[model samples]
Each structure stands twice: as structure tokens, then as C-alpha cells.
Target: ASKSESPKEPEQLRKLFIGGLSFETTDESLRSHFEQWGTLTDCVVMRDPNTKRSRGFGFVTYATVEEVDAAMNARPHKVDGRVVEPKRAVSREDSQR
Candidate 1:
């Protein structure tokens, strides 16, 4: 896409996922906390297949790169006296590494 005609949001400036959290935590909790860093498009807590309990982790999608940077800069937010790490969604290559 051309400059003016180009989308303000470059596809690369997309959302991400966060992992390593407590199953008891809720989406509202994450949204309330992560909002401090940037606007979150979605907060999803993965659920167990059998128990249906939280997977202790979730994905947080942001609309832009700025938000991703903010999340990286302010990771491991403290909630209920415990710190949780939030980072950019890993790409396939990253997962291999």
C-alpha cells in the first residue's frame, strides 16, 4: 500500500499473546492491569480440556506495535501479590528457538 493510501496500521503492528499465569486469574484482571500499558483488543484465558479450569495463561492482543512495546517494557505485572510475565506473541521461528 502507498503512503497516504496505506493503512495507518501496518500489519506487523499487530497484537500478541501472554503466558505463564495462574489459572484462577480472570480476563478482567488482566484487562484492568494491562490497560495501564496500552489498549488491549482481546484477553483470552485458555481452558483445560477436561477440568475446564484456566490453563494458568492467556493471550493478550494489541492493536499496534506501541502497545506491544509497552507490554514488553512493563512485563511481569504484580497482581494479588504475584508477578506475571507478558510478552509479544511468539512466532513459529521463535517457538523453534
Candidate 2:
């Protein structure tokens, strides 16, 4: 397959699963908070498609593994007055076992 047609490989950056987000947090606010840490390859605050409200948790991926490590150890995380917790994400298969 050509480069444009190539299947996208899964992102290798550390996936930090963040919790305790405010109900009002959107994709933009989520990015603003975490961008200070490092380059963000992807960021999202999960929302109910129907209710259109934040799920109070989301995933932010860094461009490098070290960036995530640094952020995790740097300081306590907070988003809009809520104390946020970050953790390395485990696969769904692992959680099911």
C-alpha cells in the first residue's frame, strides 16, 4: 500500500489515562491543561454522544514516553478545581481477565 493508504499504526506514545475531570471540560480545555507538560499527539475528553457531557475522564497521549513520565512525577494534577489522577492505561483484554 502507498504511504497515504498505509494502515495507521497505533500511537507509541504513553497513553495517560486521566480521571476526575470536570463535567464541563471539553477537548480544548483538556488540551490546554496538558499541553504544558509536552507535545500532545492526541487528546480527548470522552463524552456521551447523546447527553453531550463529559464522562469525567479522558486520555492524553504524549509525543514521547519520557514526557508522560515527567508529567506524572512533576506535580499533582488538577483540572478546573478537580484533582485529576493520571495512570498508565491497561488494555481492555487485561482488565477483563
Candidate 3:
């Protein structure tokens, strides 16, 4: 999955960047579970260059805007004994109204 950027517009089809993931998680497994709620564009497990182990995190991209929102509301996802949750992939805008 592509590195996440700052919080983008809803039209960007926002992706969920997970962290503190287990080393056992696989890209295919992640996609299958996440696709249940929305269209999964991609899901990749990051690995450390030295250890070559999972960085305990991955990115999941939704194909549409609706899916992203749905993911946010449906917090606390579950995957391989890990409690998957929606997290901020980019820095918060800190918008002032």
C-alpha cells in the first residue's frame, strides 16, 4: 500500500493505515477481512529491512467515499486475534471554524 499522506478530502477514497500490527498478518488475509465492509483497493504488510518481519501494520484503501466513512464509524475491527481499528493515516487538519 502507498504511504499515507495528510488527511485528504473525502473524494480521495481515504485509506486506513494500521499500526502496531502483528508479524503474522498477511496482505491477502487483511484484504479478505476488510473487503467484507467495503471495496478494498489494496492492503500491504510493511516489513522491516533488517529483521524482515511485519511492522505490525498495513494500509487498507477503500474504493469509494462511502466505504471510508463507514469504516470510521465501525471502529474496533478484528483480524487474526488483533483488534483492528480505524486510525488517522495523516496529520489532523486542526481546522478552526
Candidate 4:
């Protein structure tokens, strides 16, 4: 009889806040730029629900914690011709006035 492979522990998802994005940036565009660092859990471009336009910022969730370091070090990166600033994402409530 063969033994089954052991299940591996799930890696914590790392989220990075991306700012200074162009209003034209989209989820796909962000993914295209950041995916080089690692697998992405999710990518979103904040937008006005009614207008469906970018809010000039977004968040990227990475599958591996290592991806965070890679992205942050990729500093001076640009999306849609605008330099992007990446940092640990603060909670939504913390960001609100």
C-alpha cells in the first residue's frame, strides 16, 4: 500500500497597498506588473462604483510572504506611465478619517 502525501500548511496571504497609480490602471494591469514577483491571491483597483473609474490606487494580495519583499524592493515601478508606491496595507477603517 502507498502512503498519501501529507497536506502542506497554507501560506499566509500578503497584501500590499499600491498608491500613485494612474486613474487608467485596472486590476489586470496591476496583476501584469506584480505577478512577476509571485503568485497573486487577488488584485484590485479601487474605483467609484457608479463611475467605474480607478481611484488612483489599489491593493495586491500575494500568495507568498516573500512576494511582499520582492514588490516593495521593486520600487520606482510604474503602471500606465505613473510611478507606483507600494507598502503594507493599512485597514480600511484605519485609512478613513
Candidate 5:
């Protein structure tokens, strides 16, 4: 078989990185707050493995890119009385670079 020419890459752009979260925020809170914008595939507030405390950041994945876009367009989201930032998430390897 010959090498395919078409470069249709299905990148994972549906996920978003949430920052500046309040320490009081939790997975449930994050989901509840963001659900107003779109359907979420996944939502979690990163926590310290040892202390099990909020890390003040997390990842939220939407079911579709359109949803992600919608969420981003509604930037400067506030949850738990704190302004949280939403950004397109990058791969772990790419983030390290």
C-alpha cells in the first residue's frame, strides 16, 4: 500500500485547562459551574495526591470542539467567588517543552 496523502489529524482540542481556581473548588463544583456553557465529557479539580487538597487548577473536557469554543468565548469565568481562566490544553509532552 502507498503512503496516504491526506493529513486529517483528529487532534484532542476538546479539553480545556482551568486555572486560578479557588482552593475550595472541587470536581463537582467545577462541573456544575461549567455545565452552563456546554455538556462536559469530563471535569476535575487537580488535587495533591498526598494531601488530597485542591491544586488550584484542573482540566475540563467538552463533548465537542464547538462546546470548547463556546466555553472559551465566555472567558473570565468565576466559580466560588474567584475568577478562573480557561485555556486550550496542550499535551503533556508539548507542555514540557
Candidate 6:
């Protein structure tokens, strides 16, 4: 029997904020680079809605917090010929200015 269960839990610390990305970086490239550390649950390169151009930053979510640590410890990530920075991401609600 296949058991499918849905559980609700607060997702925190598993997501990382990737900065210093190149304009040429895309979602695919971003995923390709970070996947080296571990399984990625979500990966995206932020883009301008109107121009559809990379906003020079992105987010990478790992399947587990352990993966996040692996990626973070490996620091100074260079993607698309640029050294990108990764930091623990905070929820939008907490980021309000």
C-alpha cells in the first residue's frame, strides 16, 4: 500500500539567498551549480518582471538543512564566472523594512 501523507511544517533555514550573480545566470545554471552539494528542492534566479532579465541574484533551497550547511561551508561559490555569496534567507515577513 502506498501511503501518502501531507504534513505542515514551517520551512526555515533550508533556503539560501544567492547574491553577486551574473546577469547571464539563469535558473538552470543556478541549479546546475548548487546541485553539486546536494539535492535541491527549489532553485530560481530572480528576474525583472518587465524586462525579463536577471536581477543579479537568486535563491536556492536544499532538500535538507544539512545540505544547506554543506553548500554554505563550501563558500565563495563561483557561478557563470562570478563569485557568488550565499546566506541564510529570512522570510519576507521578517524582511520588512
By lDDT, the best candidate is: 6
List the candidate 1 regions with Cα displacement exceeding 4 Å: 1-13, 79-81, 92-97
Clashing pairs in 1: none
lDDT of 5 by residue, 1-97 (tens): 1122332332347777889999988888887888878977777788989889899998787767788888888877877767899988888888776
Once model 2 is optimally superposed onto the true structure by TM-score, how far is the C-alpha of residue 8 displaced, in angstroms?
12
1-97, model 4: which lDDT tens digit per residue? Answer: 1123331422223678888898888888887888888766768888888899888898887766778789888887776777999888766667676
Error of 1 at 15 (Å): 2.9
**Candidates' TM-scores?**
0.68, 0.78, 0.70, 0.78, 0.82, 0.85
Mark the 10 consecutive residues where model 6 has the least summed lDDT: 1-10
Q: Write the per-residue lDDT of candidate 2 for residues 20-93, one digit (tens) a residue.
A: 88887777787678878886677778898889888999887776777788779855886666678988766756
Any runs in candidate 3 off by more than 4 Å, and if so which? 1-13, 91-97
Candidate 2: segments with Cα more than 4 A from true spot: 1-13
User: How many pairs collide in each candidate, listed in order?
Assistant: 0, 0, 2, 0, 0, 0
lDDT of 4: 0.75
Relative to the unseen true structure, what is the Cα RMSD of model 4?
Answer: 7.3
Error of 4 at 35 (Å): 0.7
Clashes of 4: 0
| Deviation from native of the Cα of residue 29 in model 3, angstroms | 1.6
Q: In terms of lDDT, which candidate is stronger, 5 or 6?
A: 6
Ranking by lDDT: 6, 5, 4, 2, 3, 1
13-97 per-residue lDDT for model 1 (tens digits) = 4445656676676677766666777866665667888998777776666656788787787755753344777665666565776
Assess candidate 6 and give its TM-score to the true structure. Answer: 0.85
For candidate 3, what is the total of clashing residue pairs? Answer: 2
Q: State the lDDT of candidate 6 residue by residue for 33-59, as single tens digits.
A: 999998777788999999998999998
Instruction: Estimate, for each residue in 1-97, the C-alpha lDDT of model 3 and write its tens digit.
Output: 5534444545234667766556777787677767777977657777788987677888777776677677777667776668766665553354432
Query: Which stretches in model 4 have alpha-carbon errors above 4 Å?
Result: 1-13
Overall lDDT per candidate, in order of appearance: 0.63, 0.72, 0.68, 0.75, 0.77, 0.80
